[PDB]
């Protein structure tokens, strides 16, 4: 019943708070929504450095509301030269039916919450994902993310259509990290990624031997 207005959130470290719209799309019954934050390990947190309020609220049938995220002073302890990862969670509590022999389903939505420090602030539509490097290795590619941002890779194939539609195990590269992915060899690799808006662009790569980079 209760839904969130986005599939990932970027918290701009130059501000102290932001809001996410939520909504009860059930037009008949009130639902409660709980909201909390988890750290990069998906262990819960409540005192900081990011908090969600209110942690529970009631939505009348059809109601629209919001959840606010704010930072505490301890936010300054996070690295200022790379993103940090949290998770935002939104879990409905459906109204109790006192019906005999029932199974009741409660949606929980869990999205990535990227804390993006002021020093690495981005402009609308900026692309850093084109800085990825593929390296051919046994059975696939070692993908390098030299950037200060998390990069979620959802496609890798030998054409655009394969990048968007081919079977691929989603993988998220931490800032300034690398990861090996099992893959067929592609002559001109195409790579699909998810951006801050939840769109899925595709990048065209060219290889020199085992090393591949984006077409300038």
């Amino acid at each position: 019943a209760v839904s969130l207005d986005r599939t990932r959130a970027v918290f701009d470290g130059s501000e102290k708070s932001m809001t996410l719209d939520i909504s009860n799309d059930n037009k008949q019954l009130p639902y409660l929504a709980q909201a909390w934050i988890e750290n990069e390990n998906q262990e819960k947190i409540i005192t900081g450095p990011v908090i969600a309020t209110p942690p529970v609220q009631r939505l009348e049938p059809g109601a629209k509301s919001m959840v606010r995220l704010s930072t505490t002073p301890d936010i300054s302890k996070l690295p200022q030269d790379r993103e940090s990862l949290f998770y935002f969670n939104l879990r409905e509590i459906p109204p109790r039916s006192e019906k005999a022999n029932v199974l009741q389903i409660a949606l929980q939505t869990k999205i990535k919450l990227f804390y993006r420090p002021a020093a690495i602030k981005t402009r609308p539509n900026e692309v850093w994902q084109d800085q990825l490097i593929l390296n051919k290795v046994s059975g696939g590619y070692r993908i390098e993310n030299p950037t200060p941002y998390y990069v979620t890779v959802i496609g890798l194939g030998g054409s655009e259509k394969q990048a968007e539609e081919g079977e691929f195990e989603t993988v998220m590269l931490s800032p300034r990290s690398e990861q090996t992915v099992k893959s067929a060899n592609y002559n001109t690799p195409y790579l699909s990624y998810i951006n801050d808006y939840g769109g899925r662009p595709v990048l065209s790569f060219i290889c020199n031997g085992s090393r591949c980079s984006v077409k300038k």
């Binding site: 839904s3 799309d25 459906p94 109204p95 039916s97 389903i105 409660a106 929980q108 869990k110 808006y197």
Partner: protein, 149 residues
């Protein structure tokens, strides 16, 4: 419009037939259970709306752009969920359209969907938990968790 504000993919809203998001399991299937079978099967459909779930080549679930998990209390085996209420000797089992059994807190495997619908389809049934059967009323709240990539 060449020029406009930020537009983002919303997260999916979950829609069911029932306004309470309830599946009626029917009376405790005592006869069926004593003959060593599970209880009769109960179909439930979850529609995931408003997130452009379907795309030209596939859909968010089959492509692993979302990951879904049933959260609840493990019963007798990893393959079973616990039930509340007065009945005794019973667990719940949830299976997907290819018969993969859900385990509490474990992500369902990404599989391609049938009737190319906008819907996730699950099947539940009551099974034994190894304790003695005491018929009675049962209930469970199951978490259905969507993790977005």
């Amino acid at each position: 419009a060449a020029f406009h504000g930020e537009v983002v993919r919303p997260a999916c809203t979950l829609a069911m037939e029932d306004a309470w998001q309830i599946i009626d399991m029917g009376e405790t299937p005592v006869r069926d259970l004593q003959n060593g079978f599970s209880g009769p099967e109960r179909k439930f459909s979850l529609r995931l709306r408003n997130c452009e779930f379907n795309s030209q080549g596939g859909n968010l679930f089959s492509d692993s752009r979302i990951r879904v998990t049933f959260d609840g209390v493990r019963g007798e085996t990893p393959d079973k969920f616990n039930l509340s209420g007065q009945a005794k000797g019973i667990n719940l089992q949830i299976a997907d359209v290819r018969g993969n059994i859900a385990r509490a807190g474990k992500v369902m495997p990404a599989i391609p969907l049938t009737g190319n619908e906008e819907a996730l389809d699950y099947t539940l049934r009551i099974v034994r938990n190894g304790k003695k059967l005491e018929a009675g009323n049962y209930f469970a709240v199951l978490g259905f968790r969507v993790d977005y990539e």
